[PDB]
Symmetry: C2
Subunit: 223 residues, 2 copies
Amino acid sequence: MSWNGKDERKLSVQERGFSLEVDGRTVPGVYWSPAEGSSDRLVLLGHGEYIEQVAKLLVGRGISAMAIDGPGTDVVGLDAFPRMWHEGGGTAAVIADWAAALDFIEAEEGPRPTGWWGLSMGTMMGLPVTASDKRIKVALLGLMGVEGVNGEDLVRLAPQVTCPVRYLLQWDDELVSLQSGLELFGKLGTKQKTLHVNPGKHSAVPTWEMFAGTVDYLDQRLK
Amino acid sequence: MSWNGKDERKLSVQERGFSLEVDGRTVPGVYWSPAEGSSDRLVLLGHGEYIEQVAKLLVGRGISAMAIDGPGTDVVGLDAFPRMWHEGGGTAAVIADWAAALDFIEAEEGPRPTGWWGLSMGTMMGLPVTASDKRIKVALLGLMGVEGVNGEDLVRLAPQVTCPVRYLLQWDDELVSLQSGLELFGKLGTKQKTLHVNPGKHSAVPTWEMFAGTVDYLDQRLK
Ligand SMILES: [Zn+2]
Ligand SMILES: [Zn+2]
Ligand SMILES: [Zn+2]
Ligand SMILES: [Zn+2]
Ligand SMILES: [Zn+2]
Ligand SMILES: [Zn+2]
């Protein structure tokens, strides 16, 4: 667990690389925070570019963001993805890696109210992370269903997600059928869950939904 | 077509009754507007109490509201409702009555950018009205599907709804199955449609969704 690295102080958004060694694996990460001076909240960003865009907007609201790379045109739509996921340690390794990353950030920066943001592979990772780590106080999830590569893990752990959730689906998602996505949303344990569905393909979440929408939701709900 | 009636000037929200004679029927209405002094937008409120609550919030944003009574524990869940609807002239009469009501308000108050708000019977009426009257620039609809008493009319006219739409459904709605609701949302012609689904029964739309959510949506989208 150590920093490096690394980026500047002016624009207003600082960026610092870090790296972890967990259960045999080397796990690269990035931390985004305000240039000056302090930030009282944190969001973990799961992905498989839009994550840097979301991180910039969050920092603008006083919210730091952190991302590690996972077992990764969406990566989840590639024929080789299943083997990529299994060779990366699957859901167990993801849980472990994210727990170690958050431990590191809390030691270095102070424990803060923490949320999750992540779609597609970001939900393959985020739904198990939020189920497993009760430091996650709110989650934005989406673009994922029960026929995913770790569908069994998601079905098993969905009932253990007990914090507030906003879930996004795409009506015409060519990678995740609407019914498979509905089924996973249904299995989420929390009563404080809302589902937003928009027309279009997997990559076509409306930008006002992906950006303003998710950022306002986390800003309001993360306390 | 004539006013009466009638309510006051202070609180900040004025209320004026009116009455219409349309195709043989007598149609009662209400108009809500700011006490002082002018209002540049209008929303039509369809229902089968929450409508007065929504009207108050809209007026607070500078938006007038108007409601007429339709062919009406939700009325749509009563065994006698189908006969009530047919005896009231069904969808044709609803279209006619709403067109005449809006004509009246535009003559008396000036034509303004106009939206629709209405759930359940408010969507049985609102989806055909919005399809038929292109003065409707945005619609909030919900709690209704293709197995409704006028399901055939809704399926037929949904493709002709071409303005922006936010649609609400309740996951555990005992009057409208989630699949029947999904099916109707799918048939809406507009590409600028979004579906919000929340847990719970027919009467249990979260208040932040029903009030702040719908009011912010109309305020932003009605131009
Ligand atoms: Zn990346
Ligand atoms: Zn695609
Ligand atoms: Zn949304
Ligand atoms: Zn009434
Ligand atoms: Zn009920
Ligand atoms: Zn909503």
